[PDB]
């Protein structure tokens, strides 16, 4: 018998740094859901996402959700540095009753909801250089209002336009005004986008409205960090092979517990 057919039902917290997600996904902890503010600037070798995870802030969606989840998971960190973005002429710190924090209306801790100032929204053109040695990850959004009445009362323009560019890429988004099913009694939505800036490069953001602005950047790292979906409890042991069903020993050259593995694991075989 040289095929590993069983596991201990637990993920050992050693030797890899395990970060349990509890009720939070990696993207929600990235944006700054009030329930996920305990995960700020935390590091990991394997992020464990649970099936009980749920969002509890402003309803949003991420075009290409898997790639942003994979890119941040393969970085193994949530370290965030605030940058002095100069939004002169607009209102900041937008909050919502769907994003409660400390029994008060709030918003994503990493995002800045910009609206008009006295029914004027000047064309914001801001430039943020990266004079560092690492890569910066900027998370920004586009707000999609329900009606044209809200479009005007939020941004004082019948339609906004957002352009985030570097010397290498360009991202241009037009908001889509319309009704959507009410999530936490909110029929508007936010679309999340990301941009990577390299050393010597500059972040350029042009917006005439509907911009969910960043408050800074996440540091990007390279390593063997990853993410895994599992409802197995985390335990006090040591094992260099993790599967969603728990840690398995790596004695046998084969295993049939599950294909998704992390670390130095045996090869997978079907069977049962």
């Amino acid at each position: 018998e040289l095929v590993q057919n069983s596991s201990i039902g637990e993920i050992c917290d050693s030797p890899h740094q395990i970060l349990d997600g509890e009720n939070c996904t990696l993207i929600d902890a990235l944006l700054g859901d009030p329930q996920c503010d305990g995960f700020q600037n935390k590091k990991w070798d394997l992020f464990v996402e649970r099936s009980k995870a749920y969002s509890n802030c402003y309803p949003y969606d991420v075009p290409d959700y898997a790639s942003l989840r994979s890119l941040v998971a393969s970085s193994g960190t949530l370290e965030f540095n605030n940058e002095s973005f100069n939004w002169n002429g607009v209102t900041q710190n937008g909050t919502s009753s769907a994003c409660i924090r400390r029994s008060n209306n709030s918003f994503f801790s990493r995002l800045n909801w910009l609206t008009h100032l006295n029914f004027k929204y000047p064309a914001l053109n801001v430039t943020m250089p990266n004079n560092e040695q690492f890569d910066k990850l900027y998370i920004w959004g586009v707000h999609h209002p329900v009606t044209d009445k809200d479009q005007i009362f939020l941004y004082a323009q019948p339609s906004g336009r957002i352009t985030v560019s570097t010397k290498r890429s360009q991202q241009a988004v037009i908001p889509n005004i319309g009704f959507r099913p009410r999530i936490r009694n909110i029929p508007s939505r936010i679309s999340i986008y990301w941009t990577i800036v390299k050393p010597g490069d500059i972040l350029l953001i042009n917006s005439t409205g509907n911009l969910i602005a960043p408050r800074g950047y996440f540091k990007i790292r390279s390593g063997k960090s990853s993410i895994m979906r599992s409802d197995a409890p985390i335990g006090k042991c040591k094992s260099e092979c993790i599967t969603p069903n728990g840690s398995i020993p790596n004695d046998k050259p084969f295993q049939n517990v599950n294909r998704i593995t992390y670390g130095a694991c045996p090869r997978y075989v079907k069977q049962s």
């Epitope: 402003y58 209102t91 900041q92 710190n93 937008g94 909050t95 919502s96 009753s97 769907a98 209306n105 909801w113 609206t115 006295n118 029914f119 707000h143 209002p145 329900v146 009606t147 009445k149 809200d150 009362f153 939020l154 009694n185 909110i186 029929p187 508007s188």
Partner: antibody
Framework: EVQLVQSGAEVKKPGASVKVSCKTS????????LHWVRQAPGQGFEWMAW????????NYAQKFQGRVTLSRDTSITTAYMELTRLRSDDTAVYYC??????????????????????????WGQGTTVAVSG | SALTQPASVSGSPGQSVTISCTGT?????????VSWYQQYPGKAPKLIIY???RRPSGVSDRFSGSKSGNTASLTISGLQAEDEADYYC????????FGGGTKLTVLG
């Protein structure tokens, strides 16, 4: 057209209480702060208090705290100001004024992070209250 | 916690007048939340200048606002007979504060 129609002129005796109404129209009543400021005969303006018609929160001036009470009626978009223990020094014209800063957009679920005071863009015609013994 | 204005200002038709509005600090000399109001005898005030230098739609371009250090200023050029009124500045210095009021006379 934004309109603030106030109640009629009042003639009260000292020690009594007066309550002035302010019916709004032409805008979302619960989306802007509503101020109350008085002007004594021959003097300048003196801010008394404001109220958040959405939540009911108030902010009275230290000189008026304990004697004035602000309230609203969202159904008729009317706000009220009541002054108790009237003085001869309370004789003035009392104005309700709408604040400039928009603070709520309900259907998109937006609430302004903090209130900033930029001015009062629409005023009521004023309510004259004379307090004589 | 107060704003000071000149009690009275005067000018002839066609000239320019300036009404100052001085405070302390943490108001007119940190935040420009300064608004100006025109009031006719027995009438409700009317906002004529907000954000220090911005003018609501419908107010004549002859009115303008400018700051310095801890003072604000309202300038009325091309003075007319109908410009005679009391002018108040207001801002926020712990609470909503008003100036004492300036009576502007157009010398006839």
């Amino acid at each position: 057209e934004v309109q603030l129609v106030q109640s009629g002129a009042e003639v009260k005796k000292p020690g009594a209480s007066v309550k002035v109404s302010c019916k709004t129209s032409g805008y979302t009543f619960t989306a802007y702060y509503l101020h109350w400021v008085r002007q004594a005969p021959g003097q300048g303006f003196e801010w008394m208090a404001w109220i958040n018609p959405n939540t009911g929160d108030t902010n009275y001036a230290q000189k008026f705290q304990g004697r004035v009470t602000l309230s609203r009626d969202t159904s008729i978009t009317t706000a009220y100001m009541e002054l108790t223990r009237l003085r001869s020094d309370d004789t003035a014209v009392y104005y309700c004024a709408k604040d400039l800063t928009l603070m709520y957009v309900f259907d998109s679920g937006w609430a302004r992070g903090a209130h900033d005071y930029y001015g009062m863009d629409v005023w009521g015609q004023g309510t004259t209250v004379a307090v004589s013994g | 916690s107060a704003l000071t204005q000149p009690a009275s200002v005067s000018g002839s038709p066609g000239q320019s007048v300036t009404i100052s509005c001085t405070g302390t600090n943490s108001d007119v000399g940190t935040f420009d939340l300064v608004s100006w109001y025109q009031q006719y005898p027995g009438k409700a005030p009317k906002l004529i200048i907000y954000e220090g230098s911005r003018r609501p739609s419908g107010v004549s371009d002859r009115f303008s606002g400018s700051k310095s250090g801890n003072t604000a200023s309202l300038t009325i050029s091309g003075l007319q007979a109908e410009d005679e009124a009391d002018y108040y500045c207001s801002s926020y210095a712990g609470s909503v504060v008003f100036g004492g009021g300036t009576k502007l006379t157009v010398l006839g």
